[PDB]
Amino acid sequence: ERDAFDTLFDHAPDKLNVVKKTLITFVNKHLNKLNLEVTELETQFADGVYLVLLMGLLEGYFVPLHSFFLTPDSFEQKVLNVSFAFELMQDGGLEKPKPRPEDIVNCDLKSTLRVLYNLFTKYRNVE
């Protein structure tokens, strides 16, 4: 099974470009609160750190930095971080994400963008 996000990612370069553009703006609206900048969606979410921090910010709090692997030393620590971000998503009411947590760690762009897009849809009005 595929959906409209598969269709644009797979077939619509111009629409994909505004999606990416919008996602970079959105993730920085929040991550800039921590003096963090994203420039490259392809890799800067792979280690799970920004994704955890973003999830706290979208729900109005700062996640304790010792509660996840702030400087992950391995594939496994990255996967654990992504899994924790997915847990926070579900705790807040989102359906379990489509992608495996390791898909994000392995820098699958479509997986990364879908996850971020579903956050944007839900949380675009968080200040």
Curated annotation (Swiss-Prot):
Subcellular location: Cell junction, Focal adhesion; Cell membrane; Cytoplasm, Cytoskeleton; Cytoplasm, Myofibril, Sarcomere, Z line
Official protein name in the record: Alpha-parvin
Keyword S-adenosyl-L-methionine set for record: no
GO cellular component: actin cytoskeleton; cytoplasm; cytosol; focal adhesion; plasma membrane; Z disc
Function according to Swiss-Prot or TrEMBL: Plays a role in sarcomere organization and in smooth muscle cell contraction. Required for normal development of the embryonic cardiovascular system, and for normal septation of the heart outflow tract. Plays a role in sprouting angiogenesis and is required for normal adhesion of vascular smooth muscle cells to endothelial cells during blood vessel development. Plays a role in the reorganization of the actin cytoskeleton, formation of lamellipodia and ciliogenesis. Plays a role in the establishment of cell polarity, cell adhesion, cell spreading, and directed cell migration.
Gene: PARVA
Region spans: Required for interaction with TESK1 and ILK: 1-127
Keywords assigned by UniProt, alphabetized: Acetylation, Actin-binding, Angiogenesis, Cell adhesion, Cell junction, Cell membrane, Cell shape, Chemotaxis, Cilium biogenesis/degradation, Cytoplasm, Cytoskeleton, Membrane, Phosphoprotein, Repeat
GO biological-process terms attached to the record: actin cytoskeleton organization; actin-mediated cell contraction; cilium assembly; establishment or maintenance of cell polarity; establishment or maintenance of cell polarity regulating cell shape; heterotypic cell-cell adhesion; outflow tract septum morphogenesis; protein stabilization
Calponin-homology (CH) domain boundaries: 17-124
Signal peptide interval: none
Tissue: Widely expressed, with highest levels in heart, skeletal muscle, kidney and liver.
Residues of the full protein shown: 246 to 372 of 372
Known partners and oligomeric status: Component of the heterotrimeric IPP (ILK-PINCH-PARVIN) complex composed of ILK, LIMS1/PINCH and PARVA; the complex binds to F-actin via the C-terminal tail of LIMS1 and the N-terminal region of PARVA, promoting F-actin filament bundling. Formation of the IPP complex is dependent on protein kinase C and precedes integrin-mediated cell adhesion and spreading. Interacts with TGFB1I1. Interacts with ARHGAP31. Interacts with the actin cytoskeleton. Interacts (via C-terminus) with TESK1 (via C-terminus); the interaction inhibits TESK1 kinase activity. Interacts with PXN/PAXILLIN (via LD motif 4).
Keyword Membrane (UniProt): yes
UniProt similarity note: Belongs to the parvin family.
Predominant location category: other
GO molecular function: actin binding; cadherin binding; protein kinase inhibitor activity
Organism: Homo sapiens
